[PDB]
Enzyme design. Sequence first.
Site, PDB file in Angstrom:
ATOM      1  N   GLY A 169       0.435   5.288   7.093  1.00 49.38           N
ATOM      2  CA  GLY A 169       0.241   4.283   6.068  1.00 49.38           C
ATOM      3  C   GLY A 169       1.257   3.165   6.149  1.00 49.38           C
ATOM      4  O   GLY A 169       2.156   3.149   6.987  1.00 49.38           O
ATOM      5  N   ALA A 188      -7.759   2.878   2.727  1.00 51.11           N
ATOM      6  CA  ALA A 188      -8.299   3.826   1.779  1.00 51.11           C
ATOM      7  C   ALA A 188      -8.331   3.266   0.374  1.00 51.11           C
ATOM      8  O   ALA A 188      -8.716   3.995  -0.546  1.00 51.11           O
ATOM      9  CB  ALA A 188      -7.477   5.128   1.802  1.00 51.11           C
ATOM     10  N   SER A 238       4.227   7.138   1.998  1.00 48.55           N
ATOM     11  CA  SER A 238       4.303   6.877   0.574  1.00 48.55           C
ATOM     12  C   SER A 238       3.544   7.938  -0.197  1.00 48.55           C
ATOM     13  O   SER A 238       2.545   8.486   0.282  1.00 48.55           O
ATOM     14  CB  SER A 238       3.695   5.528   0.246  1.00 48.55           C
ATOM     15  N   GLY A 256       0.164   5.245  -1.840  1.00 53.70           N
ATOM     16  CA  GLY A 256      -0.940   4.599  -1.162  1.00 53.70           C
ATOM     17  C   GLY A 256      -2.099   5.540  -0.902  1.00 53.70           C
ATOM     18  O   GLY A 256      -1.964   6.762  -0.913  1.00 53.70           O
ATOM     19  N   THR A 307       2.071  -1.162  -5.775  1.00 51.64           N
ATOM     20  CA  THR A 307       0.863  -1.937  -5.463  1.00 51.64           C
ATOM     21  C   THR A 307      -0.404  -1.431  -6.142  1.00 51.64           C
ATOM     22  O   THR A 307      -1.462  -2.052  -5.959  1.00 51.64           O
ATOM     23  CB  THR A 307       0.574  -1.992  -3.935  1.00 51.64           C
ATOM     24  N   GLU A 332      -1.154   5.171  -8.717  1.00 48.00           N
ATOM     25  CA  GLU A 332      -0.193   5.864  -7.856  1.00 48.00           C
ATOM     26  C   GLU A 332       0.273   7.212  -8.422  1.00 48.00           C
ATOM     27  O   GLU A 332       0.555   8.115  -7.613  1.00 48.00           O
ATOM     28  CB  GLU A 332       0.981   4.919  -7.524  1.00 48.00           C
ATOM     29  N   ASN A 346      11.572   4.483  -4.925  1.00 44.87           N
ATOM     30  CA  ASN A 346      11.715   3.047  -4.779  1.00 44.87           C
ATOM     31  C   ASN A 346      12.556   2.458  -5.900  1.00 44.87           C
ATOM     32  O   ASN A 346      13.369   1.566  -5.651  1.00 44.87           O
ATOM     33  CB  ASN A 346      10.331   2.412  -4.696  1.00 44.87           C
ATOM     34  N   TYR A 390      10.539  -5.417   0.798  1.00 43.81           N
ATOM     35  CA  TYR A 390      10.392  -4.184   1.564  1.00 43.81           C
ATOM     36  C   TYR A 390      11.403  -4.136   2.695  1.00 43.81           C
ATOM     37  O   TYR A 390      11.957  -3.076   2.987  1.00 43.81           O
ATOM     38  CB  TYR A 390       8.965  -4.031   2.106  1.00 43.81           C
ATOM     39  N   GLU A 422      17.155  24.566  10.695  1.00 38.65           N
ATOM     40  CA  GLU A 422      18.459  24.626  10.044  1.00 38.65           C
ATOM     41  C   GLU A 422      18.449  23.851   8.724  1.00 38.65           C
ATOM     42  O   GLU A 422      19.190  24.201   7.794  1.00 38.65           O
ATOM     43  CB  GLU A 422      19.562  24.093  10.981  1.00 38.65           C
TER      44      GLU A 422
HETATM   45  N1  LIG Z   1      10.068   1.561   0.214  1.00 40.04           N
HETATM   46  C1  LIG Z   1       8.939   1.045   0.641  1.00 40.04           C
HETATM   47  N2  LIG Z   1       7.827   1.278  -0.104  1.00 40.04           N
HETATM   48  C2  LIG Z   1       6.657   0.776   0.308  1.00 40.04           C
HETATM   49  C3  LIG Z   1       6.549   0.022   1.453  1.00 40.04           C
HETATM   50  N3  LIG Z   1       5.263  -0.339   1.569  1.00 40.04           N
HETATM   51  C4  LIG Z   1       4.568   0.178   0.532  1.00 40.04           C
HETATM   52  N4  LIG Z   1       5.441   0.856  -0.253  1.00 40.04           N
HETATM   53  C5  LIG Z   1       5.174   1.603  -1.462  1.00 40.04           C
HETATM   54  O1  LIG Z   1       4.151   2.501  -1.109  1.00 40.04           O
HETATM   55  C6  LIG Z   1       3.248   2.588  -2.180  1.00 40.04           C
HETATM   56  C7  LIG Z   1       1.925   2.055  -1.658  1.00 40.04           C
HETATM   57  O2  LIG Z   1       1.544   2.892  -0.595  1.00 40.04           O
HETATM   58  P1  LIG Z   1       1.107   2.286   0.832  1.00 40.04           P
HETATM   59  O3  LIG Z   1       1.774   3.055   1.975  1.00 40.04           O
HETATM   60  O4  LIG Z   1       1.383   0.793   0.867  1.00 40.04           O
HETATM   61  O5  LIG Z   1      -0.497   2.519   0.853  1.00 40.04           O
HETATM   62  P2  LIG Z   1      -1.215   2.912   2.229  1.00 40.04           P
HETATM   63  O6  LIG Z   1      -0.545   4.158   2.714  1.00 40.04           O
HETATM   64  O7  LIG Z   1      -1.154   1.733   3.197  1.00 40.04           O
HETATM   65  O8  LIG Z   1      -2.691   3.301   1.767  1.00 40.04           O
HETATM   66  P3  LIG Z   1      -3.804   2.168   1.507  1.00 40.04           P
HETATM   67  O9  LIG Z   1      -3.315   0.749   1.820  1.00 40.04           O
HETATM   68  O10 LIG Z   1      -4.249   2.396   0.079  1.00 40.04           O
HETATM   69  O11 LIG Z   1      -4.952   2.434   2.478  1.00 40.04           O
HETATM   70  C8  LIG Z   1       3.767   1.708  -3.308  1.00 40.04           C
HETATM   71  O12 LIG Z   1       4.521   2.455  -4.246  1.00 40.04           O
HETATM   72  C9  LIG Z   1       4.633   0.714  -2.567  1.00 40.04           C
HETATM   73  O13 LIG Z   1       5.659   0.155  -3.367  1.00 40.04           O
HETATM   74  C10 LIG Z   1       7.676  -0.234   2.233  1.00 40.04           C
HETATM   75  O14 LIG Z   1       7.611  -0.924   3.271  1.00 40.04           O
HETATM   76  N5  LIG Z   1       8.881   0.297   1.802  1.00 40.04           N
HETATM   77  C1  LIG Z   2      -3.338  -3.739 -12.920  1.00 38.10           C
HETATM   78  O1  LIG Z   2      -3.227  -3.040 -11.737  1.00 38.10           O
HETATM   79  C2  LIG Z   2      -3.625  -3.737 -10.589  1.00 38.10           C
HETATM   80  C3  LIG Z   2      -4.505  -4.835 -10.696  1.00 38.10           C
HETATM   81  C4  LIG Z   2      -4.924  -5.510  -9.533  1.00 38.10           C
HETATM   82  C5  LIG Z   2      -4.431  -5.113  -8.285  1.00 38.10           C
HETATM   83  N1  LIG Z   2      -4.770  -5.763  -7.001  1.00 38.10           N
HETATM   84  C6  LIG Z   2      -5.329  -4.876  -5.968  1.00 38.10           C
HETATM   85  C7  LIG Z   2      -5.038  -7.185  -6.920  1.00 38.10           C
HETATM   86  N2  LIG Z   2      -6.023  -7.586  -6.122  1.00 38.10           N
HETATM   87  C8  LIG Z   2      -6.306  -8.888  -6.037  1.00 38.10           C
HETATM   88 CL1  LIG Z   2      -7.615  -9.451  -4.998  1.00 38.10          CL
HETATM   89  N3  LIG Z   2      -5.667  -9.834  -6.695  1.00 38.10           N
HETATM   90  C9  LIG Z   2      -4.655  -9.475  -7.511  1.00 38.10           C
HETATM   91  C10 LIG Z   2      -3.938 -10.489  -8.230  1.00 38.10           C
HETATM   92  C11 LIG Z   2      -2.897 -10.112  -9.064  1.00 38.10           C
HETATM   93  F1  LIG Z   2      -2.227 -11.050  -9.750  1.00 38.10           F
HETATM   94  C12 LIG Z   2      -2.534  -8.771  -9.200  1.00 38.10           C
HETATM   95  C13 LIG Z   2      -3.228  -7.799  -8.482  1.00 38.10           C
HETATM   96  C14 LIG Z   2      -4.310  -8.144  -7.643  1.00 38.10           C
HETATM   97  C15 LIG Z   2      -3.554  -4.034  -8.218  1.00 38.10           C
HETATM   98  C16 LIG Z   2      -3.139  -3.330  -9.344  1.00 38.10           C
END
Ligand SMILES: Nc1nc2c(ncn2[C@@H]2O[C@H](COP(=O)(O)OP(=O)(O)OP(=O)(O)O)[C@@H](O)[C@H]2O)c(=O)[nH]1
Ligand SMILES: COc1ccc(N(C)c2nc(Cl)nc3cc(F)ccc23)cc1
Lengths: 424, 54, 346, 437
Positions: free
Chosen positions: D10, D99, D140, D143, D179, D183, D206, D224, D254
Amino acid sequence: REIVHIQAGQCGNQIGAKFWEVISDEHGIDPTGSYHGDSDLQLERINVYYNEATGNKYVPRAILVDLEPGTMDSVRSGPFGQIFRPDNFVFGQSGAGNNWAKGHYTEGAELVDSVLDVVRKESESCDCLQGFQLTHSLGGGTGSGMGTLLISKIREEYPDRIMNTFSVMPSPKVSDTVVEPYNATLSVHQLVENTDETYCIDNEALYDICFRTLKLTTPTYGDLNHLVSATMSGVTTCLRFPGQLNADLRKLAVNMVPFPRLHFFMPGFAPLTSRQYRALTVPELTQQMFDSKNMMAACDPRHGRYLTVAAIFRGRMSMKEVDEQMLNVQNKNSSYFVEWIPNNVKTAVCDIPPRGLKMSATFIGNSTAIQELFKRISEQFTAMFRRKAFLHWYTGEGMDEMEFTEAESNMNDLVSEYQQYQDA
Amino acid sequence: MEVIELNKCTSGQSFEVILKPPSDPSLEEIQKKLEAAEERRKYQEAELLKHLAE
Amino acid sequence: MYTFVVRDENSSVYAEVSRLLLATGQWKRLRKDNPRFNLMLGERNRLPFGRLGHEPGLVQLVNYYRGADKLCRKASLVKLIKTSPELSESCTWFPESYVIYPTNTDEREVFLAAYNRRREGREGNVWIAKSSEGILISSEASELLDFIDEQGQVHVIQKYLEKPLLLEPGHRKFDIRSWVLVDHLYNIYLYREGVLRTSSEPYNSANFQDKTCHLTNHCIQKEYSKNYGRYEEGNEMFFEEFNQYLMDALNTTLENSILLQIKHIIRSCLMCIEPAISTKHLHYQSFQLFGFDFMVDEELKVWLIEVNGAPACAQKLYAELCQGIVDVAISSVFPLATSIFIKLHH
Amino acid sequence: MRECISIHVGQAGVQIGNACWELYCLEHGIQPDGQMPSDKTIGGGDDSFNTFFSETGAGKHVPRAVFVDLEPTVIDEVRTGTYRQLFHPEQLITGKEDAANNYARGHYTIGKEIIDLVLDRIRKLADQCTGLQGFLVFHSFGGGTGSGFTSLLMERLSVDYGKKSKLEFSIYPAPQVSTAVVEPYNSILTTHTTLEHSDCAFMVDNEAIYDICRRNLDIERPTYTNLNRLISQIVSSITASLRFDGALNVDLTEFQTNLVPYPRIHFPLATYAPVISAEKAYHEQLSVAEITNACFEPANQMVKCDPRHGKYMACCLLYRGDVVPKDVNAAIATIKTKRSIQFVDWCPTGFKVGINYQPPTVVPGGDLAKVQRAVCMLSNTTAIAEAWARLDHKFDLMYAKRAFVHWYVGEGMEEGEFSEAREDMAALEKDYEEVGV
Ligand SMILES: Nc1nc2c(ncn2[C@@H]2O[C@H](COP(=O)(O)OP(=O)(O)OP(=O)(O)O)[C@@H](O)[C@H]2O)c(=O)[nH]1
Ligand SMILES: COc1ccc(N(C)c2nc(Cl)nc3cc(F)ccc23)cc1
Ligand SMILES: Nc1nc2c(ncn2[C@@H]2O[C@H](COP(=O)(O)OP(=O)(O)O)[C@@H](O)[C@H]2O)c(=O)[nH]1
Ligand SMILES: [Ca+2]
Ligand SMILES: [Cl-]
Ligand SMILES: [Mg+2]
Ligand SMILES: [Mg+2]
């Protein structure tokens, strides 16, 4: 990844043309489909909305639909008219007479297969089609009837893609015909079943914004569509611009929609512009964008609760200041955010601002006060339907009073569903 | 407080310090679960498509 | 504008703090489960400390010290006094005490070693028993442990103070309640006003089955006592009358004979546990109001009996004290748009 | 010598992996093209750095690493970045659509489609191993891929390598950088399905990294990149005993033996010090005592919680730079006197210590400054269960209304997997509480 765009009807096509103008400017593409911008960010995700063609050309992935050629011809002769591929113009001759039944059941059925043929051609040339966005009106004939007909067809041929719509809600302050409640209600029934996410663009709201705050004494459809193209560019920025949050239509559906039917979004924009000089400060931007007076759906947000909120900030500004301000709003008004969806407000920033603005803010709220909109329509529906007024235009096309009754019930059920969570 | 199992080398050392004594499913079942969810999905799609046919 | 949340409706002191907070017009109250609060007046039991301090853009503050139970439940406090070097088993202001578990670690086999030396040396050998209703004061052990095992929870039994200081007229016992507020910086503040919860029955050193002249609870005195309120309204003599009595009858000041020892004991106990409970570098902050209960013997020597962690005031002093909690515990962290506390530092 | 295969799943896992392998290469003097001049044994060896790098005949040192994501935009940045030549193409595995922040989509709908390809590519790494000892899996909690695909891959690794150790580095969710609203759901789901397939897991919150970066690096709104370079430091501190000469934590087993007595409670708390800005003009260098003391400030933990109100089951100190044992035991003594450090009955009150004399390597141009000495404390305290509480409570708020449940069910998941997972976590929370109070 790729988005396939559809605009249907007079209203659909007008706001769609304006949308393509606006974002074609934002991405540096000129009315001939040749890129002429300077930066990088303008092309990183250009393919989400455009196909590449011979000679480094960009063609919008858009299908124009109507039952009468008037507005389509207007678009071709319009500013960007020659940016679209002409084969993607699909039109009838007879019109639909502001009649939902004609658009869905008689005139539009005749035309719907060829529209789907063009859709099919556009999708098979996609590397990974994420879904469709449809622009249309719910009070007209082609937009409401034939667009919702399009939508369920599309759902049948592509049941695993996202259906998203910009839907303009009819209002007596901006009204073409009396049957607009009927059409609207019959459409809403469709939408609540076959869209993942719908932006309710209320013409009432757009009128009041042009009148009470932009100080426009006689608003034209143009004044209304300028707000609309503003709002559309806002709510799609995270789709077409590379950001930290790397968003698409399905993620937006997943995160904004707790329950599958309650997918009707209240959009908002700030600063409200007319067709200025003073830069807005991030605290200003942030509490204008939450202001009822900045929402394109006519509902009082304080009359219900937010299920989810997405908030986009365009321009060069302080990420720290935006974080702080967003948090002050949530923490100072936490009455109006449901507590059973923790951290239901998400924020995105895009460095590129819209044309003519140092900084702007766009708002996408899924709130239970949207119920007010549907209640409005339902009242207007009933005042006529309790006397079967104007029904003959519909029974003339093969429709039954029963269908009306069912649409009405479903919208009333929708309102109740919103009321269920306004008190949870 | 006694210092035990000191092992040391040109990159560093390691040791211990005591301050006080003491007072899975198979490939079969997994593909069955994956295919079960595929079936429910295909069934919801069939439900949808029949409705759209109606 | 600041936001707070109330999770213990059954707290008199903090109900009055809630009213005082709203009155400012700078504090709105939220629903008990809304996590976007600045201030939590938490529940008394299983307060969710782990969920505090994780709201971004919110400085968060709570009216209990996680870990303070080690001072405020009776077996815990005995354990703390014995095992902690800062207090030591040689503590000269806490009675000899022992932790006993019912029949159903324990200290009765160490108890008996001291009790029989008290009975042989022909010393006063009264001992009291209680845990955290169900009190036995007896002269021989086989009454004490026999009673402990009829109940089913951990108990402490400690050397009864046989020669207490008796107020005349009336020849009666009393306890002294001090209210102490520890703020988020760990300033220890002792409220200028304390109270003397007295008994309305002359002290009968004969049979220890009558609890009316040996236990000084405001509850057991209103109901089952003969002349509740004959000498003072509600059985409560405040500090001015008691200082005056000390001067007239005994030729001293409350400050000199008693308070100095109390300020020492408070500061002892709190500074002892400070490293375990302090929130100086934590992601949320704590203050807490404590009720130290003291018993003075006939030689003007102060003894500590209980520390209560969720204490009520005296109806006369709620206003001033709760306004003080606001001033020094709450407005110090959340400021708005001649102090009633003595600060203990040495 | 026994090799370790790193798997990054991811967005979060892949960007953290980028960070760690950049650090790794600076540290072992491996250039971006894969050339390590200090390596006289050309084309092979059983050196300590070989547990993470295999060698080609052409002197190229290649990470024992797979990157997997269900959409291509993040791993594409690996394929075109500074270290593109480091990685052989079939170690970078991308799908076509992600996903969508949905565990059910990543575990069931898309995972099934891509699990056998990934397993084949991991097998091509394992087949280059004389004595593979197991996997380090970065992902993560939040995600869709990171939760869903990971737990499917953990299940299948337990099948195809049942005697091999599996360690996790897991990003716990925090709202300042999150994101997705769902979550907590993905976090509970992936934890319940993975729990029995993971021997030790290092959780990184985080929220913690963000605050560390604001307080100590004076970064006003961390990215990030900031977060990852600090996390890579901690990860390098944890794995260095696998890549360098030493006697402590030499194999993955270990880590379980030293940090995880009860198998379920396999979540050590990482605490790191010092973290010092590069823009600090006048900085003066912290003593062994000062940094070993900072190891017990909750502001330096990888997870914000209060070990004073918990119990320890294990404790390990990893120093890097100018450190000798005697200064270590000095600082330990004084700290034991001035801090609340309670062990469980049945555990020795003690510290397993490792020193590596080379100070932390820092990324040139980054936010972190060289220091002469640094330390990472891995402590299995029950206080980390605080985090599970927070998570579970958020979970519960949402699930009480079945909010968003429909998205998961529509991918073929059954509503009961929700309760089942929550149901296990309430077990976990109770284990922690009885072990600790
Ligand atoms: N510390 C850190 N957290 C990250 C990073 N990228 C994403 N996250 C955290 O990971 C979570 C989101 O999971 P992701 O790994 O981005 O999602 P994914 O595994 O790509 O799965 P999908 O995009 O949904 O298909 C959130 O809590 C983010 O803040 C990173 O580069 N560093
Ligand atoms: C309230 O929770 C969430 C709501 C929306 C989203 N995402 C997937 C978003 N997607 C797109 Cl296209 N534009 C967005 C514009 C925004 F200012 C914020 C999020 C956006 C993620 C979490
Ligand atoms: N905002 C906006 N609303 C419009 C526009 N044109 C028509 N409408 C509204 O749409 C409804 C009429 O439907 P229309 O689109 O003309 O019929 P159709 O061509 O069959 O879809 C009425 O409520 C009009 O106010 C427009 O350009 N902008
Ligand atoms: Ca070699
Ligand atoms: Cl194996
Ligand atoms: Mg018209
Ligand atoms: Mg992703």
